[model samples]
Every structure is written in C-alpha cells, then in structure tokens.
Target: RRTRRRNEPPLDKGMIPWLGHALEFGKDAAKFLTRMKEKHGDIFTVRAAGLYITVLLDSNCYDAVLSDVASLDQTSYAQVLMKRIFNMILPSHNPESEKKRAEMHFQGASLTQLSNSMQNNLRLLMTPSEMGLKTSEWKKDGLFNLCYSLLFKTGYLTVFGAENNNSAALTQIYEEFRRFDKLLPKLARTTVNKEEKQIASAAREKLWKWLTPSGLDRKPREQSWLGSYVKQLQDEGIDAEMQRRAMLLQLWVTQGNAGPAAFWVMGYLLTHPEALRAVREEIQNTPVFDSVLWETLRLTAAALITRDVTQDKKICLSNGQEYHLRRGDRLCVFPFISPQMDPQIHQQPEMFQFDRFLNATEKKDFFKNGARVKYPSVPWGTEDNLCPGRHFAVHAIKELVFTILTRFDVELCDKNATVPLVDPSRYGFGILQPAGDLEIRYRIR
Candidate 1:
C-alpha cells in the first residue's frame, strides 16, 4: 500500500502537451521565469523539454534548497550532460566522488600552487607579438571575437601545453573547437547537424592524437593542471579515447565560460567609464581587484541551478514554508532572477553599478520578511557542487582585464556603443554575453 501526497505545486503544462513551456523557457529563461513568478508566486511547476521543473522563487528558498543538498541531488544535470553531449560518463558519478576530486585538485594548497602559473600564462599571452596585434595602433575589432581569440588560445595553451611550435595544428584544433561549440543547440536537441557532426568527429580524433602519453610528454609544462588530470584518468583505467572525451569535458568546464565572462567584464567596463576609471585607480591603489569582476558577474551570470529529488520528500524552507516534491521531479532556482536582479534587493537592478559590490559590509536578507541570507558575488555556483575551476577562472579573468587596462588604453570604436543585448542563443548556459560583438580600438600604453 502507498500513501497519496497532496502538496504538489501548481504545474503549467503549457498550451501544447508534452513539450510544455520549453520554447519560452529555452528562448529566455530569465524572462519566462519572471513572468511565471508574477502569475504563480514563489512556488510553481513548469514542464520543460520533457522534464518537470519546480522553480523555487524566493531568496530564502535558495538558501534552504542549497543547504539541503543530500535530499536534493545536484549531479543529475551534469551526469546527463556528460553522456548526452560529450559522449562520455562523468568522471565522478557520486557526489562524494565529485567532492573528493574537487578538493584534491581545486581547493586550498593545490589552487595556491596553480595561481603563479596562471598569472605567468597571462603575461606571456598578452603581448602584441603573442596576441597577433601587429603594431601599437588603435585598431578596431569585435570585442567578443578579440576576447575569445586571445583568451581561448592562451587558456587552451595554459591547460593543454603548446605542441612544440606547432601553431598550425593548434590553430586547426581551435577552429574545430569553435565549430563544436556553436553546435551546442543542435547537440542538446539530440539532432546534431551534419557540419557539426563532421567537425566533432575530426575534433575527437585530433584530441586523441594530442592527448596521448607520448604526445603530452613532448610539451614540457610538467605542472600542467590538465596534465595532472590526464594522469589521474590513466591511473583509473580510462583509456585514450575515454581520456579524450574526459579531457574535452575538462576543457569545456575550465575554458568555456571564461571567454564569455571576460567579454562581459570588458564590455561592462568599456560602457561604464566611471567604473573603468575607478577600477584602474584600484589597480594602482589597492592590492585587491575583485570589485569589477564580481559586479559584472552579478549582472550577467544567470544559470538555472537545478537538482533532482532522489525520493518523495518535503522541502522545508526557513521562511516557514514547505513544498511536497515527487521523486524524479527536477528542482530549479534561477540565481540570476532571485538575489541578483530582484528590484528590491538590488536598487536599479538594470543599471551596471560597478562599485555596487565594493566595500560591502554585511549581507542583505534579500527578503521582504527579512532573514539573514548568504549570497554569491560570483556565479561560480552555489552549494557544495561549485565549479572546481572557480579559482582558476577568476584569476584568469582578473589578469585578462588587468592586462588590458595596464598595457593598453581602450575606447569603443562606435564611441557611443552601450553594452549590447544578451545573446538569446546562450540563454541558460551561464553568464549573459553581447548578442553581437562590440568593437573597440586599443592603443599600446
């Protein structure tokens, strides 16, 4: 005999059956969810792309849901994403395994050991000669492309060492990377396009050749982080092809978000002259430089943080609210919407206030009811399942921005180009990026 549950939240199955509210959700999650919140309040259900997603709308709910990670499992999305997109099993299947692996490589002493190398990589990659910037002229080019070109190339080389002056090979590999990345939508639909399929096959083969033990040995960066990762995979009996997929996953995890994130920070700074001046002053005056980086992330990053209920359970919120969740139903908290863009929590949520996060004294409850809340400055993620490469990504972006500020005087080519609209194609992916690239001219200082 089984007991019937009664506290299920309101479900918006959409006008179409099965498919539900997917199109709207997929198009722009922030907008869709905001509309839903207005109609359905803080707790409601919406079916999306064949899955039922129960969205927690309040800031207290975010704290509540993230705190109780045992009942609400976070690894479900990662697991599916790995198998479906990357064509590989996630390295650590269990939360314990994930935590252990993250702690081993990404936290504490290990992170400290890697910082100097990251800064060194930035210094090596930022020069006119290194970056293919011919002369010190203020040439105009798309900011997004420029950021991706320099950051992706350097980031790739930083993690996966240069193949002994084999610039042509690396260039080809990067071209393949772009092809596969642009196919993300097609891949998610489970209907990979012909061109992307062709590119993916070639990319995998190229990755396999380069990731070989003998091939990796040719690159002399002994303390390479990804090199350490490959050794771990080999130790665990993960072979060449499996290791290739694993490495692909690692590269995506480590390198994918940084480029777009860099673009946003740079775009914001270029648009906000006062912020840029303040940041430049901070660069010279203070030892710490996280103000601009943090504020930019708050405005731009909006990942749909998801979890799966392992069993029929009740989500007890600190705000004296409880919701009955069925087994296998997914729980989502759009961190982008809650404490980040909440009008009340952040005054003038639409405006980019660069020093907004600077000299922050106390954390706001972010609730009308008022309860002390823990908020994230960076979208490295929440809960214990935070990005393992959070420290590295932050350090890399800081250096990228710092290098641009210190070595070059930048101004928008259009002169009046504001921060461009968020790229809808990249919605729910993570940080919002300019839909079209904004060009800027930079003169070497």
Candidate 2:
C-alpha cells in the first residue's frame, strides 16, 4: 500500500535502502545508469544518499520535460547547489529572468568591446616571448595547469578589471582562488574542519573587500558585463555581502568551462592530423571553426541537467505517455546516457569530427525515436534556461584556438600521449575534465 501510494516509477532501492544507490551511482553514474536503462527501461526511480531521483530514459521525452517550463522548476535544487558550490548568491530560481535581464550586457556593441579586451589579453598571455617559453628547446608543462593559468587567469583579469598596479596582490588572490577552487567540491559537502573553513572565509572576504567600494567602479569593470551587473544589484539595494557573492558568481559563470573545453579542443585537434589540416585551413572562417568547437563539445560534455515537478501532478510526454510526479521527487536528465553519446543520433558519436557540423543541412537532421529534436546536444542549455554567456564563451574559445594555431606551434610533450582519461567523480558536472594531466610543448610560430 505504501509503495503504491508513492505513485513512483520502477524503484531501484539497491541493496542498502536509505544509503540507496549512492555508492554505485557515486562510482560512475553513466555506467550505473546505462545498466539501469537496460533493466527498468525509460523511467525508474533511484534512491541516492536519501534523495529520490527519477531518471528519464526516453530521449524523445526531453522536449516534454524542457517545454513545460512553467510546471517544472529547476531552481529547487540548483539554487542551493550553485549557491554552495560556486558561492553563487543570485537566486537560480528564475535563471532565465536573470539571463534575459543580463542578455544585453553580453551582446552587440558590449560584446565587441569585451572581445577586444579578451583578444588583447590573449595575445599578451599566449605569445611564447610574452609567456617566457624557451626558444628552440621544448618547455614541458601539464596541459591542464597551462590552460588554467593562460586562459582562466587572463580572462579573469579582463572581466573583473584589475588595477594594473597590483601584481603581487593579484597573484596572491589568484593563489587563494586556486585553493578555494580546488577544495570547492569538499566545501560544498561541509566546513566542519575549523582551519579549512577559516581559509575559505578569508579568501572570500579578500575578494569581497576588493570588489565592493571600488572594484565595481573601475574603468575595466565599468565597461565589462560583470561590472554592469554588479551595479544593477547595488541599485536593487541587495546588501554588500550579497553583491560580493554576485560578483563571485559572475566571475564563475564567465570563467568556469573554457579552460577544460579549450584543453580538449587542442588535445583532439593536435592528435588528428586530418581534422587538424581542415581546421587549420579554415582557421579564420567562422562557420568552419565554429563547427570544430561544437564537435569537440559533443565528445567532451557529460552534463546532467535536472528539474523538479514542484507539485504532485500528472505530466504528459510528447509520445502520449503520462507519469505521476511527486512534488519533491528530482527529475534527473542524463544527456550522456541518452543523446550525447547515442550512436543513432550521431554517426560515430564517440569520435571527434570537425566537419560534422559543417554541412548546414546535416546539422538539422538529428532524431530520437523517428522525430526531430530542436537540439541534439545542449552543452550549455536550451530555450528560456539557456546560458546568457553562450555567445561570449563560444567566441572566446574560437579566438583562443585561432590565436594558438596561427601564432604558436604546439605538440604533445610525450609523443605517444592521446586523449587523457576523464575523471568519473565529476560526472554530470560541466564539460568533463581530463582525470590525469598530460604534458605539452609550445613555441612561437
């Protein structure tokens, strides 16, 4: 009677019920889920560390899940998760509203202005002479660390608008940023340890102090998208602490994914000569290089987007199927298990193909269960929930790739190194980062 009252889909409580499927799911969610897909088929409820998460097996049903934006609220969990994980304070409840309000700041004349700043910074950071790369001899460095320092740091400076006079101060802030960033996943779980909590508190206070009185009003900050957003929050009379949190959130949104995405783009292209030749020839062409960027994301992105039903209601899917959704049950959408890695939707989906997105006609033809999908892969997101920074991120990566390929010569430090293995612990996060670091060599062309 109790089980039936739940009105839930097939439940996989696993061996240990409140401990639920947490252990298995924690190991490799993708693998555990594919195993679940075969058994339960399309809809099943899995208990995870005390939370009840419903897995959507039918890829065709995505349109149904995303289209009913009014019924399903993503903000239920995302608000809390992002708040804790990224120190994000902006309510994620209506990210679309925020995205809409902030859209203008990322487009048109504002975009051009931001692009110029990004490019100038890129040139200074990427050039071997400027970066201090040794001339003839190959300077060895871990690709992940290299990409982080080169792209993340430079991009950080551009968006937040640093004072040119504070090199030492900025360097110290960045080191703490790394410490805070590295221990971030843990900080999300708890701050029980006294010393660790103190460190993060200090780092955040430092950033908050730097940003409040003058950071937002600086010339670079005044011109940048983040600066304008901060001012908007200030106008709303949100407290200084909240505004500083907003500032941290802004930095996170702009800077988070590019490092890993760029690393993978260069990683795959540098390995495949044919794809390399194609992208190199069309390096300056937007449509062609843009295709390369999308293709790379298709292979690397393993994001798990979710939404909550918000009420005990019967929701209808596109295929005329209906399911009773509990008010608090989590609807977990694993794109990796569904379309992102589906061979039927993408020919040789596991492999990277630069020209895959080149054929404009071919781009529109992806299907799930015989019907067309508006989006075959959503690396950022879609429609009302789409990322406001999408255009900026795409352009930044394109230029970064273009700058590297055109101005610098690069190859794997270990000639035999291929794609680095992915870290499973971070599954369903942003673009999957390589588990282990690989070495690379670069010099000015």
Question: For every model in order, what is the number of clashing pairs?
Answer: 0, 0
Candidate 1, residues 229-283, lDDT tens digits: the string is 6666666666667876776776666667787789888998889888877778877
RMSD of each: 3.5, 3.5
List candidate 1 segments past 4 Å from native. Answer: 1-5, 90-98, 163-169, 189-224, 285-289, 317-319, 359-372, 376-378
TM-score of 1: 0.87
Candidate 1 residue pairs in clash (backbone atoms < 3 Å): none
Over 1-445, each residue of candidate 2 has an lDDT whose tens digit, in order, gives 1153444578887778577887777666778888898898777888877777788856666656767766678765767776666565653233544566568877888778777888887776665554557466566667776666666766676776654525456556566665666555456544327887777777776766654445343443443466556656666666667876766666556676787788888888877788889788776436666777888888777777778877675655557667776877788877776677777678788788887776742466777667775677767755545666677777777877887788778888777778888876557767777788878877767
Off by over 4 Å in 2: 1-7, 86-97, 134-137, 163-175, 186-224, 316-319, 359-362, 368-373
RMSD of 2: 3.5
Backbone clashes (count) for model 2: 0
lDDT of 2: 0.70
RMSD of 1: 3.5
